[PDB]
Write an enzyme that holds these catalytic residues in place. Structure first.
Site, short mmCIF file in Angstrom:
data_model
loop_
_atom_site.label_atom_id
_atom_site.label_comp_id
_atom_site.label_asym_id
_atom_site.label_seq_id
_atom_site.Cartn_x
_atom_site.Cartn_y
_atom_site.Cartn_z
N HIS A 89 4.39 -4.11 -11.53
CA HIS A 89 5.82 -4.30 -11.77
C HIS A 89 6.10 -5.10 -13.04
O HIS A 89 7.23 -5.56 -13.22
CB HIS A 89 6.47 -4.99 -10.55
CG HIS A 89 6.12 -4.35 -9.24
ND1 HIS A 89 5.15 -4.84 -8.40
CD2 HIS A 89 6.65 -3.28 -8.61
CE1 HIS A 89 5.06 -4.07 -7.34
NE2 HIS A 89 5.97 -3.12 -7.43
C1 LIG Z 1 1.77 -0.72 9.76
C2 LIG Z 1 2.86 -0.29 8.81
C3 LIG Z 1 3.47 -0.95 7.81
C4 LIG Z 1 2.92 -2.18 7.11
C5 LIG Z 1 4.75 -0.41 7.30
C6 LIG Z 1 5.49 -0.86 6.29
C7 LIG Z 1 6.54 -0.07 5.66
C8 LIG Z 1 7.24 -0.49 4.62
C9 LIG Z 1 8.31 0.32 3.94
O1 LIG Z 1 8.71 1.48 4.73
C10 LIG Z 1 9.83 1.30 5.60
C11 LIG Z 1 7.84 0.94 2.61
C12 LIG Z 1 6.98 2.18 2.94
C13 LIG Z 1 9.05 1.37 1.72
O2 LIG Z 1 9.96 0.25 1.49
C14 LIG Z 1 11.34 0.50 1.82
C15 LIG Z 1 8.72 2.01 0.35
C16 LIG Z 1 9.94 2.77 -0.21
C17 LIG Z 1 8.14 0.96 -0.62
C18 LIG Z 1 8.00 1.55 -2.04
C19 LIG Z 1 6.92 0.94 -2.90
O3 LIG Z 1 5.80 1.73 -2.85
C20 LIG Z 1 4.72 1.52 -3.66
C21 LIG Z 1 3.71 2.46 -3.60
O4 LIG Z 1 3.82 3.54 -2.77
C22 LIG Z 1 2.61 2.27 -4.41
O5 LIG Z 1 1.64 3.24 -4.31
C23 LIG Z 1 0.50 3.24 -5.19
C24 LIG Z 1 2.53 1.18 -5.24
C25 LIG Z 1 3.53 0.24 -5.31
O6 LIG Z 1 3.30 -0.79 -6.19
C26 LIG Z 1 3.11 -0.51 -7.61
C27 LIG Z 1 4.66 0.40 -4.50
C28 LIG Z 1 5.80 -0.54 -4.48
O7 LIG Z 1 5.85 -1.57 -5.12
C29 LIG Z 1 6.96 -0.15 -3.67
C30 LIG Z 1 8.12 -1.09 -3.83
S1 FES Z 2 3.86 -7.45 -11.00
FE1 FES Z 2 4.31 -6.68 -9.00
S2 FES Z 2 2.23 -6.78 -8.32
FE2 FES Z 2 1.86 -7.81 -10.21
#
Ligand SMILES: C/C=C(C)/C=C/C=C/[C@H](OC)[C@@H](C)[C@@H](OC)[C@@H](C)CCc1oc2c(O)c(OC)cc(OC)c2c(=O)c1C
Ligand code: FES
Ligand code: HEC
Ligand code: HEM
Ligand code: HEM
Ligand code: HEM
Ligand code: HEM
Ligand SMILES: C/C=C(C)/C=C/C=C/[C@H](OC)[C@@H](C)[C@@H](OC)[C@@H](C)CCc1oc2c(O)c(OC)cc(OC)c2c(=O)c1C
Ligand code: FES
Ligand SMILES: [Sr+2]
Ligand SMILES: [Sr+2]
Ligand SMILES: [Sr+2]
Lengths: 428, 179, 256, 428, 256, 179
Positions: free
Chosen positions: B144
């Site tokens: 980020h």
């Molecule tokens: C046991 C289960 C668990 C822990 C569930 C947790 C679920 C959380 C959320 O879902 C509701 C989540 C999926 C959802 O947030 C709204 C997404 C839109 C988040 C988007 C998201 O993705 C990334 C990603 O895909 C990546 O890939 C390589 C890498 C990333 O960094 C660079 C990200 C990242 O920085 C973000 C903000």
């Molecule tokens: S800047 Fe978001 S993980 Fe390092």
């Protein structure tokens, strides 16, 4: 609750079964519901989503017959599928690309609802159940992408469990609980496998309530004018039975969607993927060109738009005595972006249901559709100028639309008269 | 009466306990199992590291950066005033918790040559890219867009804190003990 | 880092009707064995797949003979033995030489324009094109901006984008001026380094294109089967969509 | 179809939800169904089965977060659970012993039905759905027992996959298809894991249909006399509402079952197990004292009773030109024993529902109960004399009950008069 | 093979309130290291579990010292190093010596009567009793029926039931006459083969009982935790059952 | 008409094909993957085998028994008449498929000393226990009680056939090649 005719057993087996288990009666009342006659091609995305859920499930169970949830074997077992399992390569590309199709359909499905007011009373429950389904999809798709244990798998899991570390006070506990240790390791992969399997069944249960919800109220239609219920005579002028009229339309539309979908899978199955997930997970090196899954990009763009230099963030940090820094603010902004969309029945104060008859609303809606595309596009760019501003302007409009424009529009706008009935619009 | 209502309270109270006794172990099984080490200790040989080289080492499943800083790296770090930093705390496990984020408080030695820190972005845990990356002659996190300077201090982006420095000390002339 | 320009090779396997050239994949296998294998492994490729249809399709006796040259540690015995076709290719001998099993899919050669993905939509992801450019993109003289500022143990490559770059090769904002950057791989190829049995030319051009096709097969061995399925599914669904369209039309006729 | 009062929204929140999603109306009409007042303690086993399904599911999902489906890691990952996961030893013993409780309950549940005629019209559908659940239970429990990959796991999988090899013509194809190779190996373990997870959700779906089935007709009671439906006045003299009267009775009985069950798990968790499954799978050596899981023993005893010497086998082999040898005959005998029990609604020709008022039926029923225990016991003995005869005579009686006695009994027996109503029986 | 008679030892851990004797487990641990470990491994027992509550509970420094004696192949390095507490005990050095991690649960000493399982219900499964009987059941002279017919490399044991037996030791129906059979394990124990630190007597009786207790803990390390949970659940549910009984009665009172 | 019903035929016919094309690969993915060897080849050293010893070897994931039979074993095997056997076929891959189950046709050598066969019970695949077990001086299967004699022929129980003999031959004086 529309007037319609009911089931009657005809065969001796049906008379026999109906007096013991009216399961055919249940299938009849479901498939013969009077549905508005004037539904357009934007009402197909429900079946596409339904097909996707079955496709993911059937390919999922099959893939789980050959996959190993262990950090030492996971990545190799997927290559074993690609190379050794009969048809495994095709089953893999179907499961992977099926997730993209799954997400193309909801976004079209969602924006359909936002335009035609399918979330407004009496349809709040349908919308909220939909929002719960949407969260489940994201959680499922996230955990699925971790299972191959590639570079995107590992670092996406690091980041997304990191979201929970941003809660003041309790954040570090939740993160350890999700991880099962100090870092993404085998315990994390192992539990994600069990939960990736479970949630599609929870979605199926939620979809059952979803169907029950809009069957109780009746489907919305492009005019936003409800079906007349004062008599069976006038209910029939607004509707046609779901079977055969809309079954054939669904199967037809579905065949066209699958024609495109199978062309992607057959001829460009990796277009929507990240090449870096064909690299084994490296806990010591994050790729420079790390990027989320395309269906996650809009929410990713919002989160990283809120850096320490952002003005509204610096106010938040000062007023909150430092609790809300840019890190946690971005997380609030990201989940807040989904929540305000969940709250849209109570923020849209206009009594006109369909946006087709709302002149000012159309402008801000198409900006939101354009904004959503902008957020997706900027998600894949660098954080340098001007993309940093584009993501700030885009994020700002997303919250302004739900929290400012929609409340204000319902108390200022001069809407056009909708048709008197659904019958009038169809004949036109 | 008073003896009649007591049963309906005691029964419901027992029922409430039974749910709680069943739910806690369903949560706690996801907490770290006994095979998980929270903290450990290891030793790193450094005699082969010339200035301008970063050694990246795995410790508790995460990267640790051991960089032998050049003259330029050290000078830049010391030229930054405390008030120009996002995070003015040293984030150094080896000294007092209230120490300031001066370049002197960010290195193991008095000469300021040995920068040892967790290569774990304090935003959401990605590994920042070194080799003098970013806009501040340090590290760039590609996840980020956080920029850290030559002393590993956060200067730009969403990350709230400087890269943490683990317990680290030279056991002899050429070996660092982490933990 | 960033993306860059790749040389657009016309590989036989591109396009919906594209297929592997059997003789080309075999030449590429010889290049891999005689040159790349010294440093690079293919730990996910079973050696027996050199016989499978849709690849080099060498006779099973040749593959059995080919497998002997590798020294494999038997899993039960733990002692060394000659390789079998059921064994995989060895791991990379050189610790920092990446595994090439999936390289032709783990690299994208086409990017943009302005991050809209339109380039990949028409030209493909471009992994084997990228590989070809790296094997080709070693100039004899480096760029003028680093005449005497080259990191030791590294080599300038036009196409490599993830490498370090001397300070004299950056603009006022620190972004590199050069088309490429410095890679730790020394130039592996050179004219007629390999002696093809059928007398095919072994210029750096030919070997780079031949081995890129082989490395595309090692990453996507089922490429041809996938397209047949794609063609079949599309032909089924084309007929089915037409028939369902006519059905939908004749049904709604009794409403409007 | 019994007369009863329906739900009515009272709070403003209830009026709001009921006009959108009548989920409270469905839960109310379910939990307040008028149930016969005179149900005895044999009607509790439905809730026990219900508890078991949830217990197995919740502990199963949890166990799968720490288990590895790979032959090199499976056995070790269970010991990892036993030793390292917090409370893992307790969750495993709950899951393992939970399977035994699951099977104790069906057999009591099933034999309850056979005595009181709960399978007789109009309850055939209820009975058949039960039989489908029962097959699913066996397949699920079998595959679960394979996952630890102990000696009993491996050789049980060898034998049970061998059952399908006994089918003439297609047997070897089905066997190869189930195994994924020439022998029980990793491909077999990997796919059994995927299916062990899936089937409990199918059981849950079947249980939903099961409940819907006996809600349409109403519960049977010990007298076999149906609730009066001519008016609401006389339905209440035969019934009390399910909530609170039978909810509290179920919760009480459940607390007592768990008292025993948790004493077993706490103090003798391995009594119902086989020590040899604490030995790693050895494909070169079958343990000498190999024995099936106790809940499989009756069907195992039937299968192995039909050796080459048995004369009906020698007739079957001769008449069938060699197709039906002792091997295939034994497989037919085992699945046939389950099938005739599925067919008992159409084999029992008596019009008297409850066996309480069938003097001759009671005799042959209690012999069947004794036979089932005998069959269980002989399953654990050697195949030498006299056990070889005990198992043949026992198998013969099982088939005689369904295929001979019950058809004959319905045309000979002189039944006693049942009570006029449920009210009469309750006051007595 | 079959089942047989085992000597009913009164181990401290038996009974619902039974618990391990900490010093006994340490004596048993000493016996395993000094005698059994030459042939038998415990590949599922983490060495660190010697510190965990409910077992030998050695100070973490002693366990750290104990782990050093083992040579473990490090997973990342691949080179040998001294053992840590995080390592497991080694595999069996002797290929046909079974692993002892779960032996005290993988053997049943009590069977019957007439295959009704009532014996196990009252006396327990009898695994540690069985181990004791094998360690105890080596006689100096073999049974008279095999005077000069002993298979070379095997030894008569009173309690072992799965071994071979000479033809001269079977009856007219081929069933063995001897209480036990011939085992490939030579008699491992002998009076005062181990010098216990606390001066506990080191007769074959003491070592056999001590090591059986240690082997029960290695197989069921969480035994004490399991019983505490059992007591709690039973007391909870006893109270809850009583309260639910009175509740159920007072409800149905307004019906009959 | 004739073309009206034809549309409903082409549509229904296409739907049937589409289901079949989707269901078959879901079944066929469970058939043996490419990494599975169906048949292979190996060599067994036998110089260490005294009479009365059975060598048990793994081949294609299943046990293979190599027993050097004693004098008693061979005589017992030859004394059995064909009509006393459950299965009178030799089940020997090395000779004609119709060969009879005489003791001579059950061994690799003319002297009948070397009995090589699959240690896989022909009932449901368990491993029969050797060392002269059962009622016929051969093998006993503990899974459902099959008894095999000294030539590995089924004599009693549910098993339909004699233990199969794989392709096996002495490559030299002291080595057997299976396969
Ligand atoms: C046991 C289960 C668990 C822990 C569930 C947790 C679920 C959380 C959320 O879902 C509701 C989540 C999926 C959802 O947030 C709204 C997404 C839109 C988040 C988007 C998201 O993705 C990334 C990603 O895909 C990546 O890939 C390589 C890498 C990333 O960094 C660079 C990200 C990242 O920085 C973000 C903000
Ligand atoms: S800047 Fe978001 S993980 Fe390092
Ligand atoms: C040692 C003398 C090598 C020989 C011979 C070949 N390769 Fe290699 N390669 C080597 C190293 C040490 C590296 C790492 C590069 C780095 O800067 O870290 C590589 C890299 C590659 C790559 C990856 C490029 C990238 O984007 O990271 C490719 C595609 C590649 N090499 C191709 C390749 C081929 C086809 C070879 C045989 C013709 C070959 N290399 C030989 C070391 C060595
Ligand atoms: C797997 C996920 C889903 C499935 C299977 C599904 C299915 C359906 C179907 C079949 C319809 C009928 C109209 C149509 O087909 O367009 C529908 C309508 C609707 N859905 Fe969904 N949907 C899903 C996800 C969602 C989500 C994520 C939301 C909202 C956030 C949502 C909200 C709605 C609304 C508001 C309607 C209109 C109902 C009406 O016409 O009254 N759905 N859905
Ligand atoms: C219903 C919604 C589902 C969604 C949105 C979904 C999504 C995904 C995604 C995006 C991946 C990553 C694919 C890759 O890049 O390799 C994945 C992986 C995987 N999923 Fe799912 N999945 C679903 C259902 C299931 C189910 C029900 C199962 C198992 C029973 C399953 C099993 C797997 C397996 C084994 C993998 C790893 C192998 C692979 O797909 O390449 N999925 N999932
Ligand atoms: C009707 C539901 C179920 C039944 C009858 C059942 C039965 C069994 C049985 C008898 C075992 C063998 C236990 C042992 O011998 O150690 C087992 C093991 C296992 N089961 Fe289930 N099970 C059910 C539900 C589930 C579900 C839904 C899951 C996973 C999502 C699951 C996961 C496992 C795992 C991981 C094991 C191996 C670990 C162990 O042995 O404890 N079970 N199951
Ligand atoms: C997981 C397995 C099962 C569950 C959760 C379940 C659940 C229930 C419940 C809650 C009842 C009502 C309470 C009672 O009568 O005890 C019931 C009744 C009944 N069940 Fe089941 N059952 C299961 C399996 C079966 C099986 C295997 C059979 C037969 C082969 C069966 C046949 C019946 C019958 C005949 C009734 C009587 C209902 C009536 O009187 O109308 N069930 N079941
Ligand atoms: C992919 C999944 C597949 C192929 C599932 C198939 C399920 C089939 C049936 O369930 C419906 C089956 C479980 C059920 O047959 C009616 C049982 C009563 C079979 C009973 C059974 O068990 C044994 C067992 O457990 C063993 O353990 C160590 C060993 C066994 O030999 C010694 C047996 C055995 O000889 C029999 C007959
Ligand atoms: S498997 Fe040998 S007899 Fe049943
Ligand atoms: Sr500013
Ligand atoms: Sr091209
Ligand atoms: Sr005792």
């Amino acid at each position: 609750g529309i007037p319609h005719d009911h089931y009657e057993p005809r065969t001796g087996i049906e008379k026999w079964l109906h007096s013991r288990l009216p399961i055919v009666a249940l299938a009849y009342d479901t498939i013969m519901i009077p549905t508005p006659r004037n539904l357009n091609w934007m009402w197909i995305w429900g079946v596409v989503l339904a097909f996707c859920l079955v496709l993911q499930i059937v390919t999922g169970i099959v893939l789980a017959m050959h996959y190993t949830p262990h950090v030492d074997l996971a990545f190799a077992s997927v290559e074993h599928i690609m190379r050794n399992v009969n048809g495994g390569f095709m089953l893999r590309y179907l499961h992977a690309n099926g997730a993209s199709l799954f997400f193309i359909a909801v976004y079209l499905h969602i924006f359909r609802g936002l335009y035609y007011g399918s979330y407004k009373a009496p349809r709040e429950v349908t919308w909220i159940v939909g929002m719960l389904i949407y969260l489940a999809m994201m959680a499922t798709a996230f955990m699925g992408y971790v299972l191959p244990w590639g570079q995107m798998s590992f670092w996406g899991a690091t980041v997304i469990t990191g979201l929970f570390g941003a809660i003041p006070g309790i954040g570090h506990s939740i993160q350890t609980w999700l991880l099962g240790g100090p870092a993404v390791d085998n315990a994390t992969l192992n539990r994600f496998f069990s939960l990736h399997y479970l949630l599609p069944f929870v979605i199926a249960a939620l979809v059952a309530i979803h169907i029950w919800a809009f069957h109780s109220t009746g489907n919305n239609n492009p005019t936003g004018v409800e079906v007349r219920r004062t008599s069976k005579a006038e209910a029939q002028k607004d509707t046609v039975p779901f079977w055969p009229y809309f079954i054939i339309k669904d199967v037809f539309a579905l065949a066209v969607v699958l024609l495109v979908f199978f062309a992607i899978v057959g001829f460009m199955p990796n277009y929507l993927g990240h090449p870096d997930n064909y690299i084994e997970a490296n806990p010591l090196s994050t790729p420079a060109h790390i990027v989320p899954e395309w269906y996650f990009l809009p929410f990713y763009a919002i989160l990283r738009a809120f850096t320490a230099d952002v003005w509204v963030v610096q106010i938040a940090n000062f007023i909150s005595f430092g609790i809300i820094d840019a890190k946690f603010f971005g997380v609030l902004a990201m989940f807040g972006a989904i929540l305000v969309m969940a709250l849209v029945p109570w923020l849209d104060t206009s009594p006109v249901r369909s946006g087709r008859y709302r002149p000012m609303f159309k402008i801000y809606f198409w900006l939101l559709a354009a904004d959503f595309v902008i957020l997706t596009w900027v998600g894949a760019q660098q954080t340098t100028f001007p993309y940093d501003w584009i993501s700030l302007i885009a994020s700002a409009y997303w919250f302004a639309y739900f929290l400012v424009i929609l409340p204000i529009l319902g108390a200022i706008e001069k809407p056009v008269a909708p048709p008197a009935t659904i019958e009038e619009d169809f004949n036109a | 009466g008073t003896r009649r209502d007591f049963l309906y309270y005691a029964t419901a109270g027992a029922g409430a306990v039974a749910t709680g006794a069943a739910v806690w172990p369903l949560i706690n099984q996801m907490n770290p199992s006994a095979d998980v080490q929270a903290l450990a200790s290891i030793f790193v040989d450094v005699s082969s590291v010339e200035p301008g080289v970063q050694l990246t080492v795995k410790f508790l499943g995460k990267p640790i950066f051991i960089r032998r800083r050049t003259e330029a790296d050290i000078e830049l770090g010391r030229s930054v005033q405390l008030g120009q930093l996002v995070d003015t705390n040293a984030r150094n496990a080896n000294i007092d918790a209230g120490a300031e984020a001066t370049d002197q408080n960010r290195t193991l030695d008095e000469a300021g040559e040995w920068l040892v820190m967790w290569g774990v972005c304090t935003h959401l845990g990605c590994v920042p890219i070194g080799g003098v990356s970013g806009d501040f002659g340090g590290w760039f996190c590609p996840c980020h867009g956080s920029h850290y300077d030559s002393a590993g201090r956060i200067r730009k982006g969403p990350a709230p804190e400087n890269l943490p420095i683990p317990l680290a000390k030279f056991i002899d002339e050429t070996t660092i003990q982490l933990g | 880092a960033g993306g860059g320009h790749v040389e657009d090779v016309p590989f036989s396997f591109e396009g919906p009707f594209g297929t592997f050239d059997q003789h080309q994949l075999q030449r590429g296998l010889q290049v891999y064995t005689e040159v790349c294998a010294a440093c690079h492994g293919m730990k996910f490729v079973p050696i027996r797949s050199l016989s499978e249809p849709g690849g080099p399709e060498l006779p099973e006796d040749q593959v059995r003979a080919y497998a002997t040259q590798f020294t494999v540690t038997d899993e039960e015995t733990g002692e060394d033995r000659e390789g079998k076709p059921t064994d995989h290719f060895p791991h990379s001998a050189l610790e920092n030489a990446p595994d090439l099993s999936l390289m032709a899919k783990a690299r994208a050669g086409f990017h943009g324009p302005m991050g809209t993905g339109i380039s990949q939509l028409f030209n493909g992801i471009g992994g084997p094109e990228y590989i070809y450019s790296v094997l080709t993109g070693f100039p004899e003289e480096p760029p003028k901006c680093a005449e005497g500022h080259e990191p030791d143990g590294f080599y300038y490559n036009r196409a490599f984008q993830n490498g370090s770059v001397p300070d004299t090769c950056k603009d006022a904002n620190g972004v590199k001026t050069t088309a490429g950057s410095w890679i730790a791989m020394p130039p592996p190829l050179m004219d007629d380094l390999v002696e093809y049995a059928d007398g095919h030319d072994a210029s750096v051009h030919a070997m780079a294109e031949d081995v890129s096709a082989f490395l595309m097969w090692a990453a996507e061995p089922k490429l041809m089967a996938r397209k047949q399925a794609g063609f079949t599914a599309v032909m089924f669904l084309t007929v089915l969509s037409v028939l369902l369209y006519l059905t939908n039309k004749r049904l709604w006729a009794g409403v409007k």
